Amino acid sequence: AMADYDTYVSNVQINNLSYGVYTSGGKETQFFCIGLKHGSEAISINAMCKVDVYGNHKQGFDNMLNTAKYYYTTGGDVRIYYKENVWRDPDFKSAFSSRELIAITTCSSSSYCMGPTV
Amino acid sequence: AMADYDTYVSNVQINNLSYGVYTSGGKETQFFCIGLKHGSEAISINAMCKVDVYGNHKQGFDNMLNTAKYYYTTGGDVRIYYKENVWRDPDFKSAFSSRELIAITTCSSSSYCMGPTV
Amino acid sequence: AMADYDTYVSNVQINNLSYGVYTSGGKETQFFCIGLKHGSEAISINAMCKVDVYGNHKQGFDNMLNTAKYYYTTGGDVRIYYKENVWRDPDFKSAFSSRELIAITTCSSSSYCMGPTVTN
Amino acid sequence: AMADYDTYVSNVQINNLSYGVYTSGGKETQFFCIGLKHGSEAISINAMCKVDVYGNHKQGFDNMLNTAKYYYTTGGDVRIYYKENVWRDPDFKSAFSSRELIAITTCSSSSYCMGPTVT
Amino acid sequence: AMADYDTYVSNVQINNLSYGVYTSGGKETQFFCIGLKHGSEAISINAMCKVDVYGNHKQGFDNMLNTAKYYYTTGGDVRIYYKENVWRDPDFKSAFSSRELIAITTCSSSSYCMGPTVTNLESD
Ligand SMILES: O=C(CO)N[C@H]1[C@H]([C@H](O)[C@H](O)CO)O[C@@](O[C@H]2[C@@H](O)[C@@H](CO)O[C@@H](O[C@H]3[C@H](O)[C@@H](O)[C@@H](O)O[C@@H]3CO)[C@@H]2O)(C(=O)O)C[C@@H]1O
Ligand SMILES: O=C(CO)N[C@H]1[C@H]([C@H](O)[C@H](O)CO)O[C@@](O[C@H]2[C@@H](O)[C@@H](CO)O[C@@H](O[C@H]3[C@H](O)[C@@H](O)[C@@H](O)O[C@@H]3CO)[C@@H]2O)(C(=O)O)C[C@@H]1O
Ligand SMILES: O=C(CO)N[C@H]1[C@H]([C@H](O)[C@H](O)CO)O[C@@](O)(C(=O)O)C[C@@H]1O
Ligand SMILES: O=C(CO)N[C@H]1[C@H]([C@H](O)[C@H](O)CO)O[C@@](O)(C(=O)O)C[C@@H]1O
């Protein structure tokens, strides 16, 4: 199976964004975080972030930000692939999330979104 | 004829998108994939991907991604040029596709799309 | 708490935007500034800027600019994190403010915007 | 006159777009090409292209691509400046065009588009 | 005052746009130019341009271009800051403009635009 693709939430919408600059662990960073909803259904797995110079995958900062902004605009249904327990700066984790954003795929129906499933 | 332009599907719409980050073969990659339909019906040649650091043509990652996102937004009729049997990571090809995305051109009628045909 | 995240204004709208190029302190700069409203409420904390080659955080100029431009388009409610007393160029500070823009987050309700809320 | 601004078509609309990656003449390239509307015909005429690593002007690939995509989206009237007899890869010329895209300007009326004119 | 911010036109709309490539002085350049109107009126100062590798401020080509395109799309009211007598190739000036685009700011009402204004009637 694809490494780091085992943990996802499907058929969600990106209903909030954050983008900022921040000194973390003595380094200058950019970060963004997405906030999720699932229609009217309460979702607790509701925030995932990406940092330009930290994380399991530093690549794709701008492209992932632009992709997240796109789905915030459309309100379309997506699947979010993420990794738990990544961010080690405790101030950041408490403010935003511990989760790293890995991938965003679209859902064309209540069952199907692109990408691997477990 | 133009090398790598002999294999295409016409009058399709990009009805799904994936963008992600992924370690493949020891390298840190970005990828995106496009999902297709043929008007009202499915097409089983229905996914094609591009990878920033692997493939026959590594250039144009951002421009191809932006172009794919554009036609996902418009739902316009397009022709997709692609190359067979490119992606060799078995987990990636199982989840997404073996095909490398080469070009996207528009169709201005049910019988005409820009670019070369066989 | 997150350094430089203790000062913010919530549930505002970006109702004006400036982008330009400018020589400041002997250096060629780009800058942008956002202007804020909060409905019809009188606000005084109403402008914040980012400069490509000066500031506490020089990274993220383009991304912050495009983010600011997006919310100017939507008119949606946002929270603005900023830092006081950054820009020293007297002409620039007089035209805009001294404040450096640190982050922009969205507000999905009257009571929620993303990001930390703890203060000093 | 401005060099490479002598040849143009005015008050046209872009009705097709192509973007791809392609090996030409031993080099990896990106290209895009625009097609122009002719009456109610589906088939475009007067296609023009730009290539990232070849041409008289290699700069501005991404900006020109995004400009062309913009006017394809709006369908607005534009003036297109181009150069004839540029692309020499026979396969590319046959599939797309020999013309290199130089500039795109808007037309605010049937009688005015920005940029220089020739008589 | 802010250097290069003393000449501007306020409450205009960007109603035309040009982008192109051009060889000048042995350098390959990009440029763009904006055309302006003041509501239903034509104005005197109605065009200004930016060039990626010439001018008083070479930085910010892409960000200025994107910003100009945005306001051409929205048709919103803006203030344009510009500098006179920058482009001194007469065939470019005849074709497009002699003025260099310095900044674009918004006008949220007919009475307010963001950005510096001159000190007084004589710009002392
Ligand atoms: O074989 C390949 C491998 O690259 N490409 C050909 C491609 C594929 O065989 C199909 O897309 C697979 O479903 O088919 C091409 O020709 C198509 C195309 O012209 C489409 C346009 O809508 O029509 C397909 O014909 C339809 C037909 O019009 C329908 O009436 C009905 O008969 O079903 C067929 C199948 O959909 C043509 O087959 C293509 O360009 O997509 C040629 C490619 O060389
Ligand atoms: O205001 C602008 C807008 O572009 N630019 C000015 C720039 C910024 O205000 C700062 O870089 C933001 O952090 O400040 C310039 O001036 C500086 C510079 O002269 C340095 C020299 O070391 O001093 C900075 O002032 C120091 C001060 O001397 C110390 O006492 C210190 O502890 O406080 C300040 C910084 O807070 C001056 O601000 C610059 O060149 O960087 C001028 C720019 O025009
Ligand atoms: O399939 C993918 C997707 O990124 N990448 C594979 C990659 C591509 O399939 C190949 O490079 C494309 O030509 O092949 C590898 O053998 C390699 O070049 O190291 C392994 C790598 O995992
Ligand atoms: O036609 C194309 C399309 O990229 N490129 C050709 C390229 C262009 O036509 C030429 O560079 C345009 O000025 O000419 C070549 O002779 C070359 O410069 O090596 C061959 C190359 O295949």
mmCIF file of N, CA and C in Angstrom, chain E residues 5-88:
data_model
loop_
_atom_site.group_PDB
_atom_site.id
_atom_site.type_symbol
_atom_site.label_atom_id
_atom_site.label_comp_id
_atom_site.label_asym_id
_atom_site.label_seq_id
_atom_site.Cartn_x
_atom_site.Cartn_y
_atom_site.Cartn_z
ATOM 1 N N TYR E 5 5.880 58.024 -5.009
ATOM 2 C CA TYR E 5 4.443 57.911 -4.749
ATOM 3 C C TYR E 5 3.707 59.242 -4.882
ATOM 4 N N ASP E 6 4.334 60.221 -5.512
ATOM 5 C CA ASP E 6 3.746 61.583 -5.588
ATOM 6 C C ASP E 6 2.839 61.784 -6.795
ATOM 7 N N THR E 7 2.904 60.954 -7.778
ATOM 8 C CA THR E 7 2.017 61.101 -8.920
ATOM 9 C C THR E 7 1.132 59.862 -9.001
ATOM 10 N N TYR E 8 -0.164 60.098 -9.082
ATOM 11 C CA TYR E 8 -1.133 59.032 -9.114
ATOM 12 C C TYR E 8 -2.377 59.538 -9.776
ATOM 13 N N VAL E 9 -3.221 58.618 -10.172
ATOM 14 C CA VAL E 9 -4.581 58.920 -10.598
ATOM 15 C C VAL E 9 -5.552 58.061 -9.811
ATOM 16 N N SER E 10 -6.613 58.667 -9.323
ATOM 17 C CA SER E 10 -7.508 58.051 -8.361
ATOM 18 C C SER E 10 -8.868 57.761 -8.967
ATOM 19 N N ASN E 11 -9.553 56.744 -8.412
ATOM 20 C CA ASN E 11 -10.940 56.416 -8.773
ATOM 21 C C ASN E 11 -11.040 56.106 -10.268
ATOM 22 N N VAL E 12 -10.088 55.342 -10.773
ATOM 23 C CA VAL E 12 -10.103 54.888 -12.164
ATOM 24 C C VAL E 12 -10.439 53.401 -12.216
ATOM 25 N N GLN E 13 -10.727 52.914 -13.423
ATOM 26 C CA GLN E 13 -10.835 51.482 -13.680
ATOM 27 C C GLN E 13 -9.861 51.082 -14.754
ATOM 28 N N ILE E 14 -9.306 49.889 -14.608
ATOM 29 C CA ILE E 14 -8.445 49.306 -15.630
ATOM 30 C C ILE E 14 -9.376 48.698 -16.676
ATOM 31 N N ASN E 15 -9.410 49.290 -17.855
ATOM 32 C CA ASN E 15 -10.315 48.839 -18.915
ATOM 33 C C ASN E 15 -9.581 48.278 -20.132
ATOM 34 N N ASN E 16 -8.251 48.169 -20.098
ATOM 35 C CA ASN E 16 -7.529 47.483 -21.159
ATOM 36 C C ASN E 16 -6.226 46.958 -20.574
ATOM 37 N N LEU E 17 -5.672 45.931 -21.212
ATOM 38 C CA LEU E 17 -4.455 45.333 -20.694
ATOM 39 C C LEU E 17 -3.665 44.754 -21.859
ATOM 40 N N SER E 18 -2.339 44.900 -21.831
ATOM 41 C CA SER E 18 -1.457 44.301 -22.826
ATOM 42 C C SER E 18 -0.378 43.520 -22.114
ATOM 43 N N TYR E 19 0.014 42.366 -22.656
ATOM 44 C CA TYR E 19 1.197 41.654 -22.175
ATOM 45 C C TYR E 19 1.973 41.167 -23.392
ATOM 46 N N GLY E 20 3.283 41.329 -23.331
ATOM 47 C CA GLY E 20 4.098 40.847 -24.448
ATOM 48 C C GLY E 20 5.542 40.698 -24.082
ATOM 49 N N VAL E 21 6.261 40.167 -25.073
ATOM 50 C CA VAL E 21 7.709 40.014 -24.973
ATOM 51 C C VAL E 21 8.361 40.910 -26.025
ATOM 52 N N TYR E 22 9.585 41.350 -25.734
ATOM 53 C CA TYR E 22 10.207 42.373 -26.575
ATOM 54 C C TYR E 22 11.704 42.407 -26.321
ATOM 55 N N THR E 23 12.501 42.463 -27.397
ATOM 56 C CA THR E 23 13.935 42.617 -27.239
ATOM 57 C C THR E 23 14.266 44.088 -27.118
ATOM 58 N N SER E 24 15.094 44.468 -26.145
ATOM 59 C CA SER E 24 15.500 45.876 -26.011
ATOM 60 C C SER E 24 16.930 45.970 -25.499
ATOM 61 N N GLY E 25 17.814 46.641 -26.229
ATOM 62 C CA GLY E 25 19.146 46.857 -25.656
ATOM 63 C C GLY E 25 19.893 45.569 -25.400
ATOM 64 N N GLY E 26 19.703 44.568 -26.255
ATOM 65 C CA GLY E 26 20.392 43.294 -26.081
ATOM 66 C C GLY E 26 19.829 42.431 -24.983
ATOM 67 N N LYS E 27 18.717 42.834 -24.329
ATOM 68 C CA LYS E 27 18.076 42.057 -23.273
ATOM 69 C C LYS E 27 16.719 41.585 -23.752
ATOM 70 N N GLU E 28 16.353 40.397 -23.370
ATOM 71 C CA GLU E 28 15.026 39.887 -23.647
ATOM 72 C C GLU E 28 14.103 40.308 -22.507
ATOM 73 N N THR E 29 13.018 40.999 -22.808
ATOM 74 C CA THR E 29 12.185 41.523 -21.748
ATOM 75 C C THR E 29 10.780 40.926 -21.868
ATOM 76 N N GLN E 30 10.058 41.045 -20.747
ATOM 77 C CA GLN E 30 8.604 40.969 -20.733
ATOM 78 C C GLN E 30 8.084 42.358 -20.342
ATOM 79 N N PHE E 31 6.885 42.682 -20.796
ATOM 80 C CA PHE E 31 6.252 43.912 -20.303
ATOM 81 C C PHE E 31 4.762 43.705 -20.253
ATOM 82 N N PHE E 32 4.131 44.554 -19.469
ATOM 83 C CA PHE E 32 2.657 44.654 -19.546
ATOM 84 C C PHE E 32 2.277 46.119 -19.391
ATOM 85 N N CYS E 33 1.131 46.446 -19.941
ATOM 86 C CA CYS E 33 0.592 47.826 -19.844
ATOM 87 C C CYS E 33 -0.889 47.772 -19.504
ATOM 88 N N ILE E 34 -1.307 48.756 -18.730
ATOM 89 C CA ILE E 34 -2.734 48.911 -18.354
ATOM 90 C C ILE E 34 -3.256 50.187 -19.006
ATOM 91 N N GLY E 35 -4.499 50.100 -19.440
ATOM 92 C CA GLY E 35 -5.274 51.241 -19.955
ATOM 93 C C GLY E 35 -6.340 51.590 -18.925
ATOM 94 N N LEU E 36 -6.628 52.882 -18.800
ATOM 95 C CA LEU E 36 -7.576 53.355 -17.760
ATOM 96 C C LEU E 36 -8.730 54.178 -18.334
ATOM 97 N N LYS E 37 -9.791 54.164 -17.559
ATOM 98 C CA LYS E 37 -10.920 55.093 -17.780
ATOM 99 C C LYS E 37 -11.363 55.610 -16.403
ATOM 100 N N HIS E 38 -12.094 56.710 -16.402
ATOM 101 C CA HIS E 38 -12.636 57.273 -15.143
ATOM 102 C C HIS E 38 -14.136 57.237 -15.333
ATOM 103 N N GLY E 39 -14.747 56.124 -14.968
ATOM 104 C CA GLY E 39 -16.178 55.932 -15.233
ATOM 105 C C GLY E 39 -16.454 56.003 -16.717
ATOM 106 N N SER E 40 -17.273 56.963 -17.147
ATOM 107 C CA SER E 40 -17.655 57.147 -18.565
ATOM 108 C C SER E 40 -16.709 58.141 -19.213
ATOM 109 N N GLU E 41 -15.734 58.648 -18.468
ATOM 110 C CA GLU E 41 -14.829 59.665 -19.038
ATOM 111 C C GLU E 41 -13.474 59.080 -19.442
ATOM 112 N N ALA E 42 -12.925 59.673 -20.480
ATOM 113 C CA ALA E 42 -11.576 59.330 -20.953
ATOM 114 C C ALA E 42 -10.639 60.222 -20.149
ATOM 115 N N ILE E 43 -9.464 59.732 -19.784
ATOM 116 C CA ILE E 43 -8.620 60.672 -19.006
ATOM 117 C C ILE E 43 -7.312 60.902 -19.732
ATOM 118 N N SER E 44 -6.611 61.916 -19.275
ATOM 119 C CA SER E 44 -5.314 62.314 -19.842
ATOM 120 C C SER E 44 -4.268 61.224 -19.587
ATOM 121 N N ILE E 45 -4.108 60.873 -18.332
ATOM 122 C CA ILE E 45 -3.076 59.878 -17.945
ATOM 123 C C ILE E 45 -3.757 58.519 -18.021
ATOM 124 N N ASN E 46 -3.730 57.873 -19.177
ATOM 125 C CA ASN E 46 -4.601 56.678 -19.285
ATOM 126 C C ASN E 46 -3.824 55.398 -19.589
ATOM 127 N N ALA E 47 -2.517 55.423 -19.425
ATOM 128 C CA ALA E 47 -1.741 54.192 -19.695
ATOM 129 C C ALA E 47 -0.406 54.231 -18.977
ATOM 130 N N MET E 48 -0.023 53.053 -18.506
ATOM 131 C CA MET E 48 1.265 52.917 -17.793
ATOM 132 C C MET E 48 1.710 51.452 -17.875
ATOM 133 N N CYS E 49 3.014 51.264 -17.817
ATOM 134 C CA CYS E 49 3.576 49.918 -18.088
ATOM 135 C C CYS E 49 4.662 49.529 -17.089
ATOM 136 N N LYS E 50 4.932 48.228 -17.044
ATOM 137 C CA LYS E 50 6.028 47.693 -16.202
ATOM 138 C C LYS E 50 6.801 46.697 -17.067
ATOM 139 N N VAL E 51 8.107 46.667 -16.871
ATOM 140 C CA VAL E 51 9.002 45.843 -17.698
ATOM 141 C C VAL E 51 9.850 45.038 -16.724
ATOM 142 N N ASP E 52 10.063 43.761 -17.002
ATOM 143 C CA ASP E 52 10.679 42.911 -15.976
ATOM 144 C C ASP E 52 12.139 43.256 -15.733
ATOM 145 N N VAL E 53 12.888 43.722 -16.747
ATOM 146 C CA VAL E 53 14.331 43.889 -16.586
ATOM 147 C C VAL E 53 14.788 45.314 -16.860
ATOM 148 N N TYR E 54 13.859 46.267 -16.908
ATOM 149 C CA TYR E 54 14.137 47.701 -17.008
ATOM 150 C C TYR E 54 13.231 48.431 -16.039
ATOM 151 N N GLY E 55 13.588 49.679 -15.780
ATOM 152 C CA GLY E 55 12.793 50.589 -14.982
ATOM 153 C C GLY E 55 13.443 50.934 -13.659
ATOM 154 N N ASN E 56 12.767 51.808 -12.934
ATOM 155 C CA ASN E 56 13.283 52.180 -11.628
ATOM 156 C C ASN E 56 13.099 51.096 -10.589
ATOM 157 N N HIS E 57 12.148 50.209 -10.779
ATOM 158 C CA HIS E 57 11.882 49.157 -9.788
ATOM 159 C C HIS E 57 11.618 47.878 -10.558
ATOM 160 N N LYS E 58 12.639 47.019 -10.714
ATOM 161 C CA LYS E 58 12.499 45.825 -11.558
ATOM 162 C C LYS E 58 11.756 44.708 -10.838
ATOM 163 N N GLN E 59 11.738 44.737 -9.511
ATOM 164 C CA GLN E 59 11.080 43.715 -8.707
ATOM 165 C C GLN E 59 9.564 43.735 -8.927
ATOM 166 N N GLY E 60 8.920 42.628 -8.614
ATOM 167 C CA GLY E 60 7.470 42.590 -8.570
ATOM 168 C C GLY E 60 6.766 42.480 -9.897
ATOM 169 N N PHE E 61 7.440 42.012 -10.961
ATOM 170 C CA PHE E 61 6.776 41.954 -12.255
ATOM 171 C C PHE E 61 5.544 41.073 -12.204
ATOM 172 N N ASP E 62 5.714 39.832 -11.742
ATOM 173 C CA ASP E 62 4.595 38.899 -11.765
ATOM 174 C C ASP E 62 3.499 39.365 -10.808
ATOM 175 N N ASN E 63 3.856 39.800 -9.612
ATOM 176 C CA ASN E 63 2.818 40.245 -8.680
ATOM 177 C C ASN E 63 2.075 41.461 -9.191
ATOM 178 N N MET E 64 2.769 42.420 -9.850
ATOM 179 C CA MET E 64 2.071 43.573 -10.424
ATOM 180 C C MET E 64 1.163 43.135 -11.546
ATOM 181 N N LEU E 65 1.652 42.228 -12.401
ATOM 182 C CA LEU E 65 0.838 41.749 -13.524
ATOM 183 C C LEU E 65 -0.429 41.089 -13.019
ATOM 184 N N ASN E 66 -0.283 40.204 -12.023
ATOM 185 C CA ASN E 66 -1.438 39.508 -11.495
ATOM 186 C C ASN E 66 -2.419 40.472 -10.883
ATOM 187 N N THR E 67 -1.911 41.480 -10.200
ATOM 188 C CA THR E 67 -2.776 42.488 -9.579
ATOM 189 C C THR E 67 -3.524 43.308 -10.635
ATOM 190 N N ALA E 68 -2.820 43.718 -11.694
ATOM 191 C CA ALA E 68 -3.493 44.431 -12.787
ATOM 192 C C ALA E 68 -4.555 43.604 -13.458
ATOM 193 N N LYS E 69 -4.244 42.338 -13.735
ATOM 194 C CA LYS E 69 -5.241 41.478 -14.356
ATOM 195 C C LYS E 69 -6.473 41.326 -13.468
ATOM 196 N N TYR E 70 -6.261 41.217 -12.157
ATOM 197 C CA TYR E 70 -7.362 41.090 -11.213
ATOM 198 C C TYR E 70 -8.317 42.262 -11.329
ATOM 199 N N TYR E 71 -7.776 43.498 -11.323
ATOM 200 C CA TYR E 71 -8.653 44.665 -11.399
ATOM 201 C C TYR E 71 -9.250 44.872 -12.782
ATOM 202 N N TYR E 72 -8.575 44.434 -13.840
ATOM 203 C CA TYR E 72 -9.233 44.433 -15.136
ATOM 204 C C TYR E 72 -10.452 43.515 -15.101
ATOM 205 N N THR E 73 -10.324 42.373 -14.413
ATOM 206 C CA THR E 73 -11.455 41.449 -14.336
ATOM 207 C C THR E 73 -12.583 42.021 -13.492
ATOM 208 N N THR E 74 -12.272 42.557 -12.307
ATOM 209 C CA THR E 74 -13.358 43.003 -11.433
ATOM 210 C C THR E 74 -13.963 44.302 -11.921
ATOM 211 N N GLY E 75 -13.199 45.111 -12.655
ATOM 212 C CA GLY E 75 -13.603 46.479 -12.979
ATOM 213 C C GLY E 75 -13.685 47.416 -11.791
ATOM 214 N N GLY E 76 -13.068 47.056 -10.671
ATOM 215 C CA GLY E 76 -13.198 47.858 -9.466
ATOM 216 C C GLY E 76 -12.421 49.156 -9.535
ATOM 217 N N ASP E 77 -12.825 50.108 -8.678
ATOM 218 C CA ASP E 77 -12.160 51.413 -8.587
ATOM 219 C C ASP E 77 -10.834 51.310 -7.889
ATOM 220 N N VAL E 78 -9.801 51.869 -8.523
ATOM 221 C CA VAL E 78 -8.453 51.811 -8.009
ATOM 222 C C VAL E 78 -7.790 53.188 -8.103
ATOM 223 N N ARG E 79 -6.649 53.311 -7.412
ATOM 224 C CA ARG E 79 -5.699 54.389 -7.621
ATOM 225 C C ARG E 79 -4.441 53.764 -8.202
ATOM 226 N N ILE E 80 -3.928 54.406 -9.232
ATOM 227 C CA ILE E 80 -2.697 53.965 -9.887
ATOM 228 C C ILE E 80 -1.604 54.950 -9.542
ATOM 229 N N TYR E 81 -0.516 54.497 -8.935
ATOM 230 C CA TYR E 81 0.689 55.293 -8.759
ATOM 231 C C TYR E 81 1.625 55.006 -9.919
ATOM 232 N N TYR E 82 2.248 56.045 -10.478
ATOM 233 C CA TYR E 82 3.080 55.867 -11.658
ATOM 234 C C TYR E 82 4.194 56.884 -11.625
ATOM 235 N N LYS E 83 5.176 56.689 -12.493
ATOM 236 C CA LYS E 83 6.310 57.591 -12.590
ATOM 237 C C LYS E 83 6.433 58.021 -14.052
ATOM 238 N N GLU E 84 6.521 59.327 -14.276
ATOM 239 C CA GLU E 84 6.619 59.864 -15.627
ATOM 240 C C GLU E 84 8.002 59.666 -16.241
ATOM 241 N N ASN E 85 8.010 59.584 -17.583
ATOM 242 C CA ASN E 85 9.225 59.708 -18.375
ATOM 243 C C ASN E 85 10.225 58.590 -18.074
ATOM 244 N N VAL E 86 9.730 57.367 -17.896
ATOM 245 C CA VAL E 86 10.627 56.239 -17.650
ATOM 246 C C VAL E 86 11.016 55.542 -18.951
ATOM 247 N N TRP E 87 10.024 55.164 -19.757
ATOM 248 C CA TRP E 87 10.276 54.423 -21.003
ATOM 249 C C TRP E 87 10.588 55.455 -22.074
ATOM 250 N N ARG E 88 11.815 55.423 -22.537
ATOM 251 C CA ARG E 88 12.353 56.441 -23.409
ATOM 252 C C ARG E 88 12.712 55.854 -24.776
#
